[PDB]
């Protein structure tokens, strides 16, 4: 039932245009995450939450069709797992020294200069990131590693972006 | 006075580490809009917030000093004047209509394409934007443009890219 119980959650969250808005994964995600005591939240607002629409919006339509958001659904899946076990004393918050870590087990190997920039964008003034910093984190460097893997055809390791592309990808996120 | 005025703003903004936070940023912003009815919004968010402070956060210490926080708001006054001049209708928020008028006196020229983005991204349902989104808008889409010039000295309309230039680009932002 598997299959059948997510068409039937997609179908329900999407409602009466078939797609999946801002405010509604907005509401999806913090009515799952009054379940997770464990993780600690100031609630996922209405820009992460357009950020992650728009990023995961790859035939863009403004909103997350069933293919878009069962990749995103999937990857939030794996990633709050992830969240738990790196939690390694339960503060319920990822800090500065199990961040490496969990990155790590989602198969982000970053290096130590890319960490510290993250930790200034998404952890608070202790260096301890909460669970919807950590997923608005994690969808954001996904898209950028697929992004940049849809430009380098060749395999190359460096892209080429022009400036209509770079604005493309930087403002629809 | 205006720059004797300006350092006390400062001064007294960033506070006791001498750099204004998001936070600090968040807590000015949403002051200074109450004062100003004429400028609809539901308010500046904090994730909005450090997003604008990324952006701006040219030497990578987290906060804005007092020359980045001085580019922002410099930039903050030019566009608010921008956005009660193109809000030809008095309706405090910017229209699909009145979008380009604004854009092409704050100096950016954007293919329908790139509107359609940025409205799907910052507007509302019927295309009307308020004020905090379209600053954030702006914010960003200068300091996108900036970025890739910093990077394209000889204006070839391309810049070149490895893994690493690019998540440092993407995700400090
Ligand atoms: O604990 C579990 O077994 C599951 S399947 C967790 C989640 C499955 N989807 C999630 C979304 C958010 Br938001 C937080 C937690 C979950
Ligand atoms: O209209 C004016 O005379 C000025 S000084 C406007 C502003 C100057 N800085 C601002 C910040 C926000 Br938020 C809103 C309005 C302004
Ligand atoms: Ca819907
Ligand atoms: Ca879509
Ligand atoms: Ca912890
Ligand atoms: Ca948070
Ligand atoms: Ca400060
Ligand atoms: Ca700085
Ligand atoms: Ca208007
Ligand atoms: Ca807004």
Not at 75 to 86: L, P, S, V
Not at 98 to 123: D, K, Q, T, V
């Amino acid at each position: 039932e598997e299959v059948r119980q997510f068409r039937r959650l997609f179908a329900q969250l999407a409602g009466d245009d078939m797609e999946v808005s801002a405010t509604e994964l907005m509401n999806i995600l913090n009515k799952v995450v009054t379940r997770h005591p464990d993780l600690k939240t100031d609630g996922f607002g209405i820009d992460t939450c357009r950020s992650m629409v728009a990023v995961m919006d790859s035939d863009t339509t403004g909103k997350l069709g069933f293919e878009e958001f069962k990749y995103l659904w999937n990857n939030i899946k794996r990633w709050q797992a992830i969240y738990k076990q790196f939690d390694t004393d339960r503060s319920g918050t990822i800090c500065s020294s199990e961040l490496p870590g969990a990155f790590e087990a989602a198969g982000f190997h970053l290096n130590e200069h890319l960490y510290n920039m993250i930790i200034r964008r998404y952890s608070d003034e202790s260096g301890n990131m909460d669970f919807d910093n950590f997923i608005s984190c994690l969808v954001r460097l996904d898209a950028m590693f697929r992004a940049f893997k849809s430009l380098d055809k060749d395999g190359t390791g460096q892209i080429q972006v022009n400036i209509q592309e770079w604005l493309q990808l930087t403002m629809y996120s």
